């Protein structure tokens, strides 16, 4: 909801910046072997436990 503590807000801000795919240029690099970022999440499928 609208009321939040400072500690809860920083957790949300960090959880929101980490939630991104692999940038499209990295895929062209000779040494790079990852397909998809397995740390990506959806609000419909997991809980953060920020509480």
Partner 1 sequence: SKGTPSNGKKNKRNHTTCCRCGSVSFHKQKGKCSSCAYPEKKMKKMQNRKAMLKKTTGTGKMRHMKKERISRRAGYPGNPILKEIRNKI
Partner RNA sequence: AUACCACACACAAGGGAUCGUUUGGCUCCUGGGACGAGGAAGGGCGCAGCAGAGAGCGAUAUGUGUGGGAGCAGCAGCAAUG
Partner RNA sequence: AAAACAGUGAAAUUGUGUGUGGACCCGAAUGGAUCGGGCCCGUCUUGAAACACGGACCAAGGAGUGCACAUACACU
Partner RNA sequence: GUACCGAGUGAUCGGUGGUGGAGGUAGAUGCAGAGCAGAUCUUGGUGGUAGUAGCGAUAAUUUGUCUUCAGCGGCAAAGACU
Q: State the residues that interact with RNA by CB under 7 A.
A: 10-11, 13-14, 17-26, 28-31, 34, 37, 39-40
Rule CB under 8 A: say whether 13 interacts with partner 1: no
Kindly tell me the burial class for residue 39, based on how many C-beta atoms sit within 10 Å of its own C-beta (0-12, 13-18, 19 or more).
Answer: exposed
The answer to whether residues 37 and 21 touch, using CB atoms and an 8 Å cutoff, is yes
* Minimum distance from residue 9 beta carbon to RNA (Å): 11
Number of residues in contact with partner 1 under rule CB under 8 A: 4
Which positions touch partner 1 (CB under 8 A)? 7, 11, 49, 51
């Amino acid at each position: 909801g609208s009321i939040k503590t400072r500690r809860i807000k920083v957790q949300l801000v960090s959880a929101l910046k980490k939630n991104r795919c692999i940038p499209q240029w990295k895929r062209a690099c000779p040494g790079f072997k990852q397909q998809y970022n397995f740390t990506k999440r959806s609000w419909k499928r997991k809980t953060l436990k920020a509480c």
